[PDB]
Amino acid sequence: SHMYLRITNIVESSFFTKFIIYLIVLNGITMGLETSKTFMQSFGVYTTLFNQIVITIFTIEIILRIYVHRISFFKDPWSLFDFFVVAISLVPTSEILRVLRVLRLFRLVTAVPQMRKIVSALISVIPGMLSVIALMTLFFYIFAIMATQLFGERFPEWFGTLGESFYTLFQVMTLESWSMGIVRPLMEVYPYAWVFFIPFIFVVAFVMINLVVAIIVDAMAILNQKEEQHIIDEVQSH
Amino acid sequence: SHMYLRITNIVESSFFTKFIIYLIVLNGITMGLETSKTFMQSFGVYTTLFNQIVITIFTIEIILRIYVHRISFFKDPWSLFDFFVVAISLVPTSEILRVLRVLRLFRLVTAVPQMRKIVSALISVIPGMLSVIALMTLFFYIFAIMATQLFGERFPEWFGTLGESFYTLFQVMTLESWSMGIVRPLMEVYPYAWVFFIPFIFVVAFVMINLVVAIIVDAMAILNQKEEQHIIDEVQSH
Amino acid sequence: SHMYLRITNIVESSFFTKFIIYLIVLNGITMGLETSKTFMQSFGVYTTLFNQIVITIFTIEIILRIYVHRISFFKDPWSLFDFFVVAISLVPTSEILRVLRVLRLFRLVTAVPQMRKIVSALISVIPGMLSVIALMTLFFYIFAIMATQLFGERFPEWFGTLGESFYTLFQVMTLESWSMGIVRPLMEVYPYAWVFFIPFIFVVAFVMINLVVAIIVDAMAILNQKEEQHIIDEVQSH
Amino acid sequence: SHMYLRITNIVESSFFTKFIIYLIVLNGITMGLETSKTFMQSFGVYTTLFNQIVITIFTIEIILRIYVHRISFFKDPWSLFDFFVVAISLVPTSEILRVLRVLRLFRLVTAVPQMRKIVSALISVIPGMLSVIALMTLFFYIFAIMATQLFGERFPEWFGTLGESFYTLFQVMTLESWSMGIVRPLMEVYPYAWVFFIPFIFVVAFVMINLVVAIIVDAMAILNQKEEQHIIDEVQSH
Ligand SMILES: CCCCCCCCCCCCCC(=O)OC[C@H](COP(=O)(O)OCC[N+](C)(C)C)OC(=O)CCCCCCCCCCCCC
Ligand SMILES: CCCCCCCCCCCCCC(=O)OC[C@H](COP(=O)(O)OCC[N+](C)(C)C)OC(=O)CCCCCCCCCCCCC
Ligand SMILES: CCCCCCCCCCCCCC(=O)OC[C@H](COP(=O)(O)OCC[N+](C)(C)C)OC(=O)CCCCCCCCCCCCC
Ligand SMILES: CCCCCCCCCCCCCC(=O)OC[C@H](COP(=O)(O)OCC[N+](C)(C)C)OC(=O)CCCCCCCCCCCCC
């Protein structure tokens, strides 16, 4: 335990955290420069080793963090993420992974408390949304099957495959070129195609708008519940 | 009644409901595989009979459910839907109906209580919206007549018909290519066409945004009404 | 006054109002049929006189309504609208006005109380919005001048004129093809054009979103003010 | 101080402020006329000197305002803006600045209290949003690096440069032609490009919607906090 505590004061120190963040920022700046072919020609050698050095340091950090937090490390989503991102960066270049290495810049989120809280807040609406997500996904899936069967033969790029219909349906949901780009061309062969896509647009839009309304109103309901109980206690206690 | 109760314990049992859901899911998976021409070549025979078997089972289920619920079955929207969807699936292939058969996967909504509640919640805003829907539809109808008269002769695809103008107006509402795709071309012949479509976009957008604002605020009003009465009773009772 | 009251019981009767609405609906149906060249060939003669008859009746109605309400008629926006729309319909065909005649179908709004209330509610947010509308319009006006000067020479269709720049800026606000259709082409000649349109998109979007947030929140503030005073009175009276 | 007060009664007078606003409006009208080549041919000489006269007056005003407010002038954002805009207008034409001169029409905002308040209100949400803006910007930056590396070689116009990828990513966020214009073309070479842009669209949309929800709900929380304390005091005092 003497050893354990020695490294624990380091890993827990303000300086340790600041250093890592410093590195994350430097490496973030570096990753953008590596975008310039000009810059690389001149200083690519400098940068590649700095990336190996940062990742070496980040690996020492994850290791030390694990000896400190023990099992609590892998029950922590933020630490898992730092693990998974640093580990990606450790797979040798010998291709998609080379690009995923830049995800280690999200470590600037996992290391900065203000950013953690933002992401925690945003994520917290999701668990209550899961069933609505399930229902929407079932909706897409049913309509994707139908679209593939109705239109996949004459419009294979957009509907010849369940995957392609899923993609197209998502495009229609975003309303991106849904009429000039998809439904009008479809209607030149299938004049009733509008009977398929208009209702689909109504549902997907109605559901999303009403999901937002429910989140706002149902939160106010809770807010009103919390303060209603506090007031009644003062009425009751006084 | 002995007979009646025997089948009522079945139809009402946890196992009965789970089985049906199992089938709905299996059949849902099956319907997606039937999308692959490759898969069909190999196993289409297997799948077609499984669809006949599932639908046979689903028909036995609807029948049994009707002997159990009697008149209460047809006063239930969820049961009507299961009826109407299973009945569609019973029309012989000898074409649009073949595709509508996939609607029986929405039965995964009518059989799962969590999903029912979602749809019930979303639907519940609609009755209060009917008049606004009526007003919007009257608005579309008037403008569709006008557009057909103003532009249908020189732009028949987009406005030559009341139906076509309805479709185009819906496209403009979604803002999909309204300017580059419709109004700018229109303005090459009718330079004041913007006087028609800009105001139309303002109204349709203003109305929809303000419908959402009213739903949120008017709900809070009710929320505040409910808790205002509860507090006053504690002030009054205490 | 004997005479005056005789016609006042008519104009105020349930039957009188229902009749007019009946006519508005019939005439509305008629206006849609007149869209079909086929229908007109066969029954155009029938319909044109029915339109003259309805408008004759509507003119008798406005007249009678004025003898009844006297000065109160022209201080009523709904009645003014019925006046202005029926008067349009009275200008002889000997062209844009022929199309504006269909506005008399909005009379179905001015005659149906449910519809009046909808429009009243929606309109009621506007007076508080006037200054924000003014600020947005000033914003457009300034940017339209700038765009005309920056881009009107090389892109006259989109920016050669203050009016054209106003139109284009509105298109960009709706986000319709703003990048592929306008800014990317602009950037082939003016590579910094993004410095103009991106900020413009940020402001217009930020302002509109925040106008909606303010309306919702400021209404809740009032709702909370009203119920806060009611509760305090019960605390104070009890 | 005698001198100081003499000019202070002027600069602070209702008449002084009204005059400036009068000029701002006249000059605003003038700036729009200067857009017409026809108008300029006839009256350009008139207008150019009127612009020199207005700016001369506006310079006298800023000067006088500074002798009056002393150090308080440069600690005032509204006054800084009037300074910075009038100063721009003072750089001799001997080009982008000639266009920036029209920014002096925003002085109609800095001089009209109603407009000041609007802008103050809208701006006031921003300080609390800074971290979310930072997180979104980090998000863009990471994805821009990735896009440049994944697609910049085969699609240089859209992704060959970190700047170009930033621009394209912003376009995708606005959903402008994201599928037909960018991702579908990308997918003809990179069939998994959807794995990159769909999630990107989900995050950016989820974050913005949820930022709006949080602003509305967190404001209500405060509203409820303020009135909860007022009620409890009446319960407690009474
Ligand atoms: C309003 C509440 C939330 C609403 C969101 C739910 C709606 C579902 C949206 C689905 C997203 C669109 C899926 C998509 O783009 O492609 C589906 C894939 C692609 O198959 P594939 O054919 O391989 O690729 C497209 C064709 N190709 C190769 C030429 C490009 O093939 C597939 O079938 C894959 C199946 C993916 C669907 C499951 C995704 C749901 C997760 C989203 C929940 C996130 C919560 C925040
Ligand atoms: C903001 C509150 C809600 C706002 C929604 C209300 C606005 C109304 C939107 C109307 C939807 C657009 C209708 C449409 O796309 O086509 C109208 C049909 C088609 O006629 P048709 O000429 O046969 O087909 C188009 C031409 N063609 C054959 C070459 C394709 O011909 C017709 O005239 C049919 C008439 C359909 C209008 C009635 C639909 C209103 C129900 C929507 C309410 C849903 C509540 C959630
Ligand atoms: C977020 C809060 C609300 C935001 C809305 C305020 C933003 C202002 C939007 C302006 C609307 C776009 C105006 C427009 O499209 O054209 C402007 C006109 C047209 O001039 P013109 O050159 O004759 O026509 C275009 C060129 N041409 C002939 C080839 C087509 O030439 C003009 O300059 C006319 C000036 C019209 C601007 C005044 C309109 C403001 C009223 C909107 C307030 C409605 C409250 C609900
Ligand atoms: C939902 C919460 C708010 C979300 C907003 C935050 C998302 C960030 C949006 C970024 C805006 C898009 C930037 C952009 O359009 O270009 C980036 C510039 C341009 O580089 P450049 O290559 O020179 O020009 C484009 C290529 N060219 C020359 C052929 C046109 O090259 C750069 O890299 C410049 C870096 C600009 C990014 C920093 C801007 C963040 C400030 C926005 C916060 C405003 C608060 C209201």
Cβ-Cβ contacts under 8 Å, B224 against chain C: 223-224, 226-227
Cβ-Cβ contacts under 8 Å, B216 against chain D: 216
Contacts of B40 (CB under 8 A, 6+ apart): B34, B47
Residue A212, CA distances (Å) to B132, B215, C80, C106 in order: 20, 11, 39, 32
Query: Contact at 8 Å (CB) between B159 and B189?
Result: no
Cβ-Cβ contacts under 8 Å, C231 against chain A: 231
CA D172 to chain centre: 22
How far does the CA of residue D195 sit from the closest CA of chain C (Å)? 22
- Determine the distance separating the centroid of ligand 4 and the alpha carbon of C200, expressed in angstroms: 13
Residue B72, CA distances (Å) to B9, B62, D114, D207 in order: 17, 13, 62, 45
The atom number, within ligand 1, closest to the CA of D187 reads 30
| CA–CA gap between residue B227 and residue C229 (Å, rounded) | 14
* Interface membership of B234 toward A (CB under 8 Å): yes
The runs of H, that is alpha helices, within C75-161 are 77-88, 96-100, 107-110, 113-124, 126-151, 156-159
Nearest to A90 by CA among A37, A60, A52, A127: A52
- On whether D163 is known to bind a ligand per the annotation, the reply is yes
- On whether B124 is known to bind a ligand per the annotation, the reply is no
| CA–CA gap between residue D214 and residue A119 (Å, rounded) | 13
Instruction: Give the torsion sign (CA, D219, D225, D227, D230).
Output: negative
Number of neighbouring beta carbons within 10 Å of residue C114: 12
Report the phi/psi class of residue D43: left, alpha or beta, with left for phi > 0 and alpha for psi in -120 to 50. alpha
| CA–CA gap between residue A171 and residue A222 (Å, rounded) | 36
Number of neighbouring beta carbons within 10 Å of residue B114: 12
- Determine the distance separating the centroid of ligand 4 and the alpha carbon of D152, expressed in angstroms: 17
In this structure, what DSSP letter does residue C71 have?
G
Q: Are residues A148 and A33 in the same domain?
A: no
Least CA distance to D231: which residue of chain B? B231
Q: Are residues B110 and B124 in the same domain?
A: no
Token pair 């009772």: residue: B237
Query: Contact at 8 Å (CB) between C150 and C122?
Result: no
| CA–CA gap between residue D79 and residue D27 (Å, rounded) | 19
How far does the CA of residue A124 sit from the closest CA of chain C (Å)? 21
Contacts of A2 (CB under 8 A, 6+ apart): none
Question: By alpha-carbon position, which residue is closest to atom 32 of ligand 1?
Answer: A163
| CA–CA gap between residue A119 and residue D165 (Å, rounded) | 24
Resolution to 1 decimal, in Å?
2.6
- Determine the distance separating the centroid of ligand 3 and the alpha carbon of C167, expressed in angstroms: 6
Number of neighbouring beta carbons within 10 Å of residue C93: 8
| CA–CA gap between residue C157 and residue B184 (Å, rounded) | 10
Structure tokens of B172?
Answer: 């403009």
Q: Which of C91, C117, C143 is the last residue of a domain?
A: C117
Nearest to D46 by CA among D29, D61, D24: D29
Question: By alpha-carbon position, which residue is closest to atom 38 of ligand 4?
Answer: D137
Q: Which amino acid would we find at residue D152?
A: G
First to last CA, chain C: 55
Q: Are residues C157 and C57 in the same domain?
A: no
- On whether D161 is known to bind a ligand per the annotation, the reply is yes
Contacts of D2 (CB under 8 A, 6+ apart): none
| CA–CA gap between residue A110 and residue A121 (Å, rounded) | 14
Residue A117, CA distances (Å) to A65, A122, D34, D136 in order: 21, 9, 52, 14
Q: Are residues B83 and B129 in the same domain?
A: no
Token pair 């007031």: residue: A231
Does the beta-carbon distance from B138 to C109 stay under 8 Å?
Answer: yes
Number of compact structural domains in chain A: 2
CB distance D192 to ligand 1 below 6 Å: no
Q: Are residues A93 and A30 in the same domain?
A: yes
Query: Contact at 8 Å (CB) between D89 and D104?
Result: yes
| CA–CA gap between residue D210 and residue A128 (Å, rounded) | 14
Contacts of D142 (CB under 8 A, 6+ apart): A102, A103, A105, A106
Q: Which of A81, A100, A117 is the last residue of a domain?
A: A117
Q: Which amino acid would we find at residue C140?
A: F
Question: By alpha-carbon position, which residue is closest to atom 24 of ligand 4?
Answer: D163
- On whether A131 is known to bind a ligand per the annotation, the reply is no
Residue of A130, A182, A204, A213 to mutate when probing chain B, most B C-beta within 10 A: A213
| CA–CA gap between residue D71 and residue D68 (Å, rounded) | 9
Question: Residue C175: helix, strand or coil by DSSP?
Answer: coil
- Rg (chain D; Cα; Å): 26
| CA–CA gap between residue A74 and residue A136 (Å, rounded) | 32
Structure tokens of D55?
Answer: 């700016």
Question: By alpha-carbon position, which residue is closest to atom 34 of ligand 4?
Answer: D163
How far does the CA of residue B3 sit from the closest CA of chain D (Å)? 54
* Interface membership of D141 toward A (CB under 8 Å): yes
How far does the CA of residue B156 sit from the closest CA of chain D (Å)? 25
After which residues are there C–N gaps above 2.5 Å in chain B?
94
Query: Contact at 8 Å (CB) between C194 and D167?
Result: yes
CB distance D108 to ligand 1 below 6 Å: no
Q: Are residues B68 and B140 in the same domain?
A: no
Q: Are residues A90 and A69 in the same domain?
A: yes
* Interface membership of C98 toward B (CB under 8 Å): yes
Residue A64, CA distances (Å) to A20, A69, A73, D97 in order: 13, 9, 11, 56
Residue of A177, A179, A235 to mutate when probing chain C, most C C-beta within 10 A: A235
**Method of determination?**
X-ray
Nearest to A112 by CA among A82, A137, A84: A82
CB distance B163 to ligand 2 below 6 Å: yes
Cβ-Cβ contacts under 8 Å, C210 against chain D: 121-122, 125
Q: Are residues C40 and C129 in the same domain?
A: no
Using CB distances shorter than 6 Å, the residues near ligand 3 are B 187, 191, 194, 198, 202, 206; C 132-133, 136-137, 140, 161-164, 166-167, 170, 207-208
In this structure, what DSSP letter does residue D189 have?
T
* Interface membership of B223 toward D (CB under 8 Å): no
Q: Which of C31, C216, C227 sits opposite B216 (nearest CB)?
A: C216
* Interface membership of B176 toward A (CB under 8 Å): yes
Q: Ligand 4 pocket: which of C194, C198, C213 to mutate (most atoms <8 Å of CB)? A: C194
| CA–CA gap between residue B175 and residue C200 (Å, rounded) | 19
Q: Are residues A113 and A124 in the same domain?
A: no
CA A104 to chain centre: 14
- On whether A174 is known to bind a ligand per the annotation, the reply is yes
Report the phi/psi class of residue D10: left, alpha or beta, with left for phi > 0 and alpha for psi in -120 to 50. alpha
Structure tokens of A128?
Answer: 């209550």
Contacts of C19 (CB under 8 A, 6+ apart): none
Pairs of residues, one from chain A and one from chain D, whose beta carbons lie less than 8 Å apart? 101
Does the beta-carbon distance from B219 to A217 stay under 8 Å?
Answer: yes
Q: Which of C74, C89, C117 is the last residue of a domain?
A: C117
Number of neighbouring beta carbons within 10 Å of residue B76: 14
Question: Buried b vs exposed e over A146-185: b needs ≥16 C-beta within 10 Å?
Answer: bbbbbbbeebeebbbbbebbbbbbbbbbbbbbbbbbbbbb
Residue D100, CA distances (Å) to B206, D33, D106 in order: 33, 17, 11
CA B152 to chain centre: 31
The atom number, within ligand 1, closest to the CA of A211 reads 1
Query: What range does the domain containing D41 cover?
Result: 1-117
Q: Are residues C92 and C19 in the same domain?
A: yes
Which H, E and C letters describe A76-142, residue by residue? CHHHHHHHHHHHHCCCCCCCHHHHHHHHHHHHHHHCCHHHHHHHHHHHHCHHHHHHHHHHHHHHHHH
Contacts of B109 (CB under 8 A, 6+ apart): A135, A138, B115, B116, B119
Nearest to C209 by CA among D176, A20, D210, A218: D210
Q: Are residues A143 and A81 in the same domain?
A: no
Does the beta-carbon distance from B170 to A198 stay under 8 Å?
Answer: yes
- On whether B174 is known to bind a ligand per the annotation, the reply is yes
The atom number, within ligand 2, closest to the CA of B170 reads 12
Using CB distances shorter than 6 Å, the residues near ligand 4 are C 187, 191, 194, 198, 202, 206; D 132-133, 136-137, 140, 161-164, 166-167, 170, 207-208
Q: Are residues D79 and D48 in the same domain?
A: yes
Question: Buried b vs exposed e over C121-132: b needs ≥16 C-beta within 10 Å?
Answer: ebeebeeeeeeb
